[PDB]
Amino acid sequence: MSLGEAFRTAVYKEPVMVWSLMIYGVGISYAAFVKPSMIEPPPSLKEVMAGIQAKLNNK
Amino acid sequence: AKGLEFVVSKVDNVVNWARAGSIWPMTFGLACCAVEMMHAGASRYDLDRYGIIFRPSPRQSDAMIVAGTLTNKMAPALRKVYDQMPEPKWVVSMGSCANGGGYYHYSYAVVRGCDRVVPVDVYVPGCPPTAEGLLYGLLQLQKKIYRSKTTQIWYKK
Amino acid sequence: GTERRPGESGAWKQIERQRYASDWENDPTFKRTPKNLAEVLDDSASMLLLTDVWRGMAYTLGAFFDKKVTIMYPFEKGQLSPRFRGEHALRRYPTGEERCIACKLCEAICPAQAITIEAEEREDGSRRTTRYDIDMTKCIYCGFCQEACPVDAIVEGPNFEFSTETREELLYDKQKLLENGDKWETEIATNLRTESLYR
Amino acid sequence: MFFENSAILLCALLSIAVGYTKSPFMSLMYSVMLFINSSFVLMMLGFEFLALVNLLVYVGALAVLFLFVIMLLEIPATELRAYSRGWSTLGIFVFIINGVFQITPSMGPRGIITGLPGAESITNLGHALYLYFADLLILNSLVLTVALFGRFAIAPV
Amino acid sequence: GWNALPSLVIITGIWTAGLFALDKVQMFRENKPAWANNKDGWQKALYRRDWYLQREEETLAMAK
Amino acid sequence: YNAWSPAQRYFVEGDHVVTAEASRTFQFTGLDSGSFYPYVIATVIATAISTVFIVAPLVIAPSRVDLDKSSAYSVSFYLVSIMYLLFDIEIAYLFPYAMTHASLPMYWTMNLFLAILVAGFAYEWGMGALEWRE
Amino acid sequence: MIVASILILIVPVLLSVAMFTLAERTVMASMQRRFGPQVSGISGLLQPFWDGLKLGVKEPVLPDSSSAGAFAASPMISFVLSQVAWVGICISDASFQGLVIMAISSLAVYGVMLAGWASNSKYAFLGCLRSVALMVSYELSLGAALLSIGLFVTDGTGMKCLNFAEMPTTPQYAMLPLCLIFLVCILAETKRDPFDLPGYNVEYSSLGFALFFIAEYANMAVMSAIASIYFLGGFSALKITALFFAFVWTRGTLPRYRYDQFMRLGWKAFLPLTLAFFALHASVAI
Amino acid sequence: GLIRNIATFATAVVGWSVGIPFVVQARMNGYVERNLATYDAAQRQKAEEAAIGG
Amino acid sequence: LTPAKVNNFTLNFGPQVLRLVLEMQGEIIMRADPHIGLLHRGTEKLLEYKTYLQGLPYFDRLDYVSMMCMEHSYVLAIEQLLNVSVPLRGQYIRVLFSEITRVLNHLLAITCHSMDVGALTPFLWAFEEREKLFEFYERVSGARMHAAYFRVGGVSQDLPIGLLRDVYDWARQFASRLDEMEELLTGNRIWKERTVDVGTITAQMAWDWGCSGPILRASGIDWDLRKTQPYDAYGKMQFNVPIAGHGDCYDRYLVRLQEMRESLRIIYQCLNEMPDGLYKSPDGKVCPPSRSTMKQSMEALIHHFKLYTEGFHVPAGETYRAVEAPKGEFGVYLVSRGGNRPYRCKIRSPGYAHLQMTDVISRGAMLADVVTIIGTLDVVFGEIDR
Ligand code: SF4
Ligand code: SF4
Ligand code: SF4
């Protein structure tokens, strides 16, 4: 049988474990590949506070 | 002194109020009268409306209602459970089988009335009595409890 | 639904059988296997997210906002019929004389042996009872006494709230039975005016 | 600081009491109390997280299994020489030498130390666990697996 | 359910009264509506320094 | 607790402060942040309440002596309790990781821990150890 | 002051537990086409009070063949744990307050076990263990759910903690399966349907029985407050009452499971799901 | 003796809590005295070293 | 011949009226030894001192859940030896009220089984319709449970006018009540997992174990006494037979529900076919006459005197008759010597036979399922202990 038949029979005979493993796989995949692609990309105290003021004052 | 007596009387009133309105019996599914008893706690009559809860143990049981015939083989067990009832306790006799034997009064293995084994406070007649009659009998039990005056007795002891 | 599933069987022999034999598949009463992504999602929605508890929950909740059948005894009573067999009672004639003539049919027919009768001729020559006792703690309220009596003397009255604190109060004598009959005569006569078309 | 020092002293008292009594249930109860009070006193050292870890683990997990094993394996054998055979004098004498007068203490030549409250950082603890002792964390994982597999292989069937 | 509705309202009212009373009592005790905030050793140090400074001010208050 | 050194009192000298600390009021915003102190007093109060409720029915209830009134009317547990032990220890291991801003290699090591955990757990699953027929 | 605050917390707990059992009775009646307690006081607004006073005046009976000290203390211990849990709910500032309450709830298992060994009842001996094993098994999943919750609990200073006042004032729409599994675990923790198979206090009586029920319903309310704080985005009376209403709703509509059945369910469906969700939340929150 | 057990337990607890501190403080007194003697001996040693070392 | 030696396991399951002693090697039941007789009232010997009419109320309290069915078997056993034909209208009334009684027995049984399992709502819900049918009983016999309505040659009284109206009105919504009853357990995974594949019974064992009623039907067995050995007007009635093939508690549950459906169908058919005519057999020498007839005729007065004192004399002989009881097959063996009292009256109870299956069925099960076994067995100790 192909992937489809075995997956169907397994999920019918045991859906919870397949759900758990699929969620784990999605998390692992997002950590490994998805995240480092689209979301991954000495000043003194006065500069930091000035930047904080600039960010806060407009909002 | 009169004020202390008045306080004693009011406390007795409150004690009777509490004990009457929260009587928890124990279930002896002996015979016919239990079905009337089961229907008495049902939606139409709502024994629970009158502060009545059936408990699995004698230890929380307040009084005993005998719903069904009592045999000689069952009498020691009934005395066992009643002797497990804590004080203050009462007994309610429902059904002629429980009353005096009734339709098995001349049998060889039937205890002619549960009176012969345990004391009884309320005798409810009928074979079977109406669930309405059981309501009336338990209300009369409440009336008997109302007339009780324990701390009044104890203060004059 | 009434369908069955693998793993939902509550045993070990059957569970061990179905996880190691496809015998349940041959059974048509078992829900058939999902065949596509849609059916798999339907099965997942069936198992997870409940969706079976939800229906009974909703029906019970509708019952919460629903009406009730509860009655407020003693300020409300139930429904009963004239044929009701309650407290035994002794009836008289409208002039005032006892209906019972001590034919002892009631005692003869009573399978409870709860009726004790003694009688002799009255000073006027009338055949009247000297002792008329019925053991209510022994009476089974069958009404066979009411069936046997040919003068409508003994009747089971519409009184059913007559519980006593002591058992001795239920040892009914002639006097208390006559008192009960004089009390409840009108209701019993009215019921007989209906029951006569059947009895 | 009377009560804090009293709680500190209670630890060794309970420790001796654990072996002192003959009822296994009493010993386990003493151990549970000792664990709780130990965690509470260590809380005075500023370890909120570690105290809860110790509490959770030992009370919820280990003591429960202790009581279960005892309850499935111990008919009362207290009179079975547990009171009639007594205790070895050499053991208590050695224990006195070791712990009452403590000829060989932990500090050795030092006789006084200052106890000072700490500052538990779960952030620093995590940094250490997963950056400085990650290898030991994996070794602990292997040890947990050893325990699980050995237990399930030593099953009495 | 009209019979249970009184109990339903009473439970909510009881919890409301209890929470309001506890709010008032703890506000009187702590004198700021943030005492439940998470605090590290830094905030603890600031709080204890401030308390000791208030005590020092009282000590120097009874000197003029 | 009461301070015993001026360094602990931030080098503030005087007698007023010592007595003030001696009879201070408890305040989370005062000197006892994260103190856990109300737990003990709650324990005392609950002990008192429970003891009183135990004692009271022995006072306001009649007593009668009866002989018969003084009478009462597996490894799956082993498996479950020992598994609970190990898994709770593992949860305690996991807890600090959830309380930090961990990094990617830290994440991978955590996943390694979880992988070993689930490996043992799944081995127990596949061998019939989670089927509680016994 | 602190003692007074403890008592001010205590009073609504007892009063409301009385009201909870009364309203559970009455709502069960409403869902059963009956009225329920209505004679004992105005609309039956006095039933639990008289019940408590009645069990107070009822005679406490002690077996002569066991250790009565544990028999007395076990309901006492459970009541103490309930009071301590309430104090930690309302009168605490611990950094791991949720973990504190979890560890507290882990302790309530003993009272059932203490009672089970105490009395000389074989079926108590068995049911105590059954209930113990159920709650113990579900405790791991509850801790895993808290682990998942702790992955986003941050204060303004930037430190990750378990403080209740720093929990977001919004519901967590992104953990609905986690919320559902946590709610079912809460249902399991209180011996309620569909986990009311185990009672353990069968040989108990009087105010001991009253304290057992007090501890049970207080733990139920504690878990309700925990759930409201965690998933419902705050702590309020409305949410407590709604959760209790839903719990009565579930009790009045479902039958209970078998022992090994909910054992299998918890050990093969709930804990692995919580583990996977915890891993996913940790991965995304990075 | 349930109440007897309670009495014995409480008596043991109180006696322990009042007696152990005395022994602890006796240990502290002995150690302080010994360290004072040690420091005096070391001071005398340093004095002798200064005398015979020029 | 047998010592005790190894005590080891010991159990006591309930003085409170079933006493059960079980044997487990742990969590799984290996032996189960019920002890009965706590309700043995010795009625069979008591019957010998009563006339046939006197002993009739004894049969009310043998199965106080289902009464008229208990009356019917004894009445038929009397009549067959008496060679008495029953009028058509009486047969209609008997069959209809028997169906109502069967409905009551099924309702109470299923509700008690649910409460033992853990469902409390259907209990309360179905007791309302049970109260309705109790009102029906009281209207026709003046007694809620112990009617003593069935008589040798007919019934005591005719139906009061206006009864069938309310019967039809009740039937107009009993289906809705049953439907709302099903949704609480039918589509539930919990109810099934509690009930599915618990206490499996085969056809061969069942016929070896003497099963009757719904338990027999759930084993793939085609059997109804109302269709194989019909009595009274049951042959005219057209209705279906539910059939299951697992011998499961869930299967028995569904079988009982479908039996209730078929009972409702028979109730409708009886309602729309009620005939006009005599309700008692015209033999006054066995059947009592009318009170009006008694009070104006010497012969009827004499017969009322004799029957109500001595009763009719059954010819010497023997017979056994059974009735398709809601709990199975209820039969009574009658031994006649020729007098006005039955010489020997043996009573056969289906629950007593079903109760004998506990030890073999409870093997391999769990303590959570013993209560399931008892509840699905549908046993009343009144008939079990006579
Ligand atoms: S009094 Fe009558 S109805 Fe009640 S249990 Fe006895 S025989 Fe049955
Ligand atoms: S009551 Fe009627 S039947 Fe009985 S003795 Fe009197 S007249 Fe005869
Ligand atoms: S009603 Fe029945 S038991 Fe009562 S007196 Fe009449 S015949 Fe006897």
Coordinates of C-alpha atoms in Angstrom, one line a residue, chain G residues 62-201:
Chain G
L62 CA -14.5 5.2 66.2
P63 CA -13.4 1.7 65.3
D64 CA -11.7 -0.1 68.2
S65 CA -9.4 -2.2 66.0
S66 CA -7.3 0.5 64.2
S67 CA -5.4 3.7 64.7
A68 CA -8.0 6.4 65.4
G69 CA -5.4 9.2 65.2
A70 CA -5.0 8.8 61.5
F71 CA -8.8 8.4 61.2
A72 CA -9.3 11.8 62.8
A73 CA -6.3 13.5 61.1
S74 CA -6.9 12.4 57.5
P75 CA -10.0 14.7 56.9
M76 CA -8.2 17.2 59.1
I77 CA -5.2 17.0 56.8
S78 CA -7.4 17.3 53.7
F79 CA -9.1 20.4 55.1
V80 CA -5.8 21.9 56.1
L81 CA -4.5 21.4 52.5
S82 CA -7.7 23.0 51.1
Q83 CA -7.2 26.1 53.4
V84 CA -3.5 26.3 52.5
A85 CA -4.3 26.1 48.8
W86 CA -6.9 28.9 49.2
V87 CA -4.3 31.0 51.1
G88 CA -1.8 30.4 48.3
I89 CA -4.4 31.4 45.8
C90 CA -5.3 34.7 47.4
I91 CA -2.7 35.6 50.1
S92 CA 0.5 34.7 48.2
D93 CA 3.3 36.3 46.2
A94 CA 5.5 33.3 45.4
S95 CA 7.4 33.3 42.1
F96 CA 6.2 29.8 41.4
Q97 CA 2.7 30.3 42.8
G98 CA 1.2 27.9 40.3
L99 CA 3.8 25.3 41.0
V100 CA 3.2 25.9 44.7
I101 CA -0.5 25.1 44.2
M102 CA 0.3 22.1 42.0
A103 CA 2.6 20.6 44.7
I104 CA -0.1 21.4 47.3
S105 CA -2.8 19.5 45.3
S106 CA -0.3 16.6 45.0
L107 CA -0.5 16.3 48.8
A108 CA -4.3 15.8 49.0
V109 CA -3.9 12.2 47.7
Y110 CA -2.8 11.1 51.2
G111 CA -6.1 11.8 53.0
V112 CA -7.9 9.2 50.8
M113 CA -5.0 6.8 51.3
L114 CA -4.8 7.5 55.1
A115 CA -8.5 6.8 55.4
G116 CA -8.2 3.7 53.2
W117 CA -5.5 2.1 55.4
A118 CA -7.2 3.4 58.6
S119 CA -10.5 1.6 58.5
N120 CA -10.7 -2.2 58.2
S121 CA -12.8 -2.2 55.0
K122 CA -11.6 -4.3 52.1
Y123 CA -13.4 -2.2 49.4
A124 CA -12.2 1.0 51.1
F125 CA -8.7 -0.7 50.8
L126 CA -9.2 -1.1 47.1
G127 CA -11.1 2.1 46.2
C128 CA -8.6 4.4 48.0
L129 CA -5.8 2.9 45.9
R130 CA -7.9 3.3 42.7
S131 CA -8.7 7.0 43.4
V132 CA -5.0 7.6 44.4
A133 CA -3.7 6.1 41.2
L134 CA -6.2 8.1 39.1
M135 CA -5.2 11.4 40.6
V136 CA -1.5 10.6 40.6
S137 CA -1.6 9.7 36.9
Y138 CA -3.5 12.9 36.0
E139 CA -1.1 15.0 38.1
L140 CA 1.6 14.6 35.5
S141 CA -0.6 15.9 32.7
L142 CA -1.7 18.8 34.9
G143 CA 2.0 19.7 35.5
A144 CA 2.7 19.4 31.8
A145 CA -0.2 21.8 31.1
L146 CA 1.2 24.3 33.6
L147 CA 4.6 23.8 31.9
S148 CA 3.0 24.8 28.7
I149 CA 1.3 27.8 30.4
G150 CA 4.6 28.9 31.9
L151 CA 6.2 29.3 28.5
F152 CA 4.6 32.7 28.0
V153 CA 4.1 34.0 31.6
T154 CA 6.4 37.0 31.8
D155 CA 6.4 40.1 34.0
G156 CA 7.4 43.7 32.9
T157 CA 10.9 43.3 34.3
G158 CA 11.4 40.4 31.8
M159 CA 11.6 37.5 34.3
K160 CA 9.6 34.4 33.6
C161 CA 7.6 33.5 36.7
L162 CA 4.2 32.1 37.8
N163 CA 2.8 35.1 39.5
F164 CA -1.0 35.4 39.2
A165 CA -1.2 39.2 39.0
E166 CA 1.2 39.1 36.0
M167 CA -0.9 36.7 34.0
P168 CA -2.3 38.3 30.8
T169 CA -5.8 39.8 31.1
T170 CA -6.8 38.0 27.9
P171 CA -7.9 34.5 27.1
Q172 CA -5.4 32.2 25.5
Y173 CA -7.0 31.4 22.2
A174 CA -3.9 29.6 21.0
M175 CA -4.1 26.7 23.6
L176 CA -7.7 25.6 23.4
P177 CA -6.8 21.9 23.1
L178 CA -4.5 22.3 26.1
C179 CA -7.3 24.1 27.9
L180 CA -9.8 21.3 27.2
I181 CA -7.4 18.6 28.3
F182 CA -6.6 20.6 31.5
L183 CA -10.3 20.9 32.2
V184 CA -10.8 17.2 31.8
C185 CA -7.8 16.6 34.1
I186 CA -9.4 18.9 36.7
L187 CA -12.6 16.9 36.3
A188 CA -10.6 13.8 37.1
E189 CA -8.9 15.3 40.1
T190 CA -12.2 15.8 42.0
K191 CA -13.6 12.2 41.6
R192 CA -16.4 13.7 39.5
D193 CA -18.0 12.1 36.4
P194 CA -16.7 10.4 34.3
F195 CA -14.2 9.6 37.0
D196 CA -16.5 9.0 40.0
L197 CA -15.9 5.2 40.1
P198 CA -14.2 5.5 43.5
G199 CA -16.7 5.8 48.8
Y200 CA -13.3 5.9 50.5
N201 CA -14.9 7.7 53.5

